[PDB]
Amino acid sequence: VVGGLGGYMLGSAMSRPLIHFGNDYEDRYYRENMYRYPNQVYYRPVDHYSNQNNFVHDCVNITVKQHTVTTTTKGENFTETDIKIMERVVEQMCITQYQRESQAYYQRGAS
Incomplete structure (x- = not known):
């Protein structure tokens, strides 16, 4: 149980996505x-x-x-500046984290 968030999870870490601002x-x-x-x-x-x-x-x-x-x-x-920059970074990292799980789920799916 992730503290009290309502059933979220946390993986590992990745490198900075290097956002094109x-x-x-x-x-x-x-x-x-x-x-x-x-x-x-x-x-x-x-x-x-x-x-x-x-x-x-x-x-x-x-x-x-x-x-x-x-x-x-x-x-x-x-x-606010910092929050938005962070949000944008976390955007790319969150797309990555979907794909992390998706690859394991897809295999338990087909090919």
């Missing part, structure tokens, strides 16, 4: 801060869920909230 600041401003961010994302197994959308939308929403909640125990803060 390329805007004004979010270009370098990501690069110089991307170290102060999560390596992974809280998700669900496809076992009873089996969708893309929820594993991106709700996965970011949970993961980002669990980078504010857990971290407020340490007294931390994030500004």
Whole structure:
């Protein structure tokens, strides 16, 4: 049981997805801060869920909230810029985490 989240899960970690912001600041401003961010994302197994959308939308929403909640125990803060950059990163990582489970589920499916 994941604390009290209502039945989410957490895998392993991955490398920074290196997001193409390329805007004004979010270009370098990501690069110089991307170290102060999560390596992974809280998700669900496809076992009873089996969708893309929820594993991106709700996965970011949970993961980002669990980078504010857990971290407020340490007294931390994030500004809006940081949240959005994080959300975008977690977007790609959450797409990855769907695919992690999906590959194991697909095999127990066909080919």
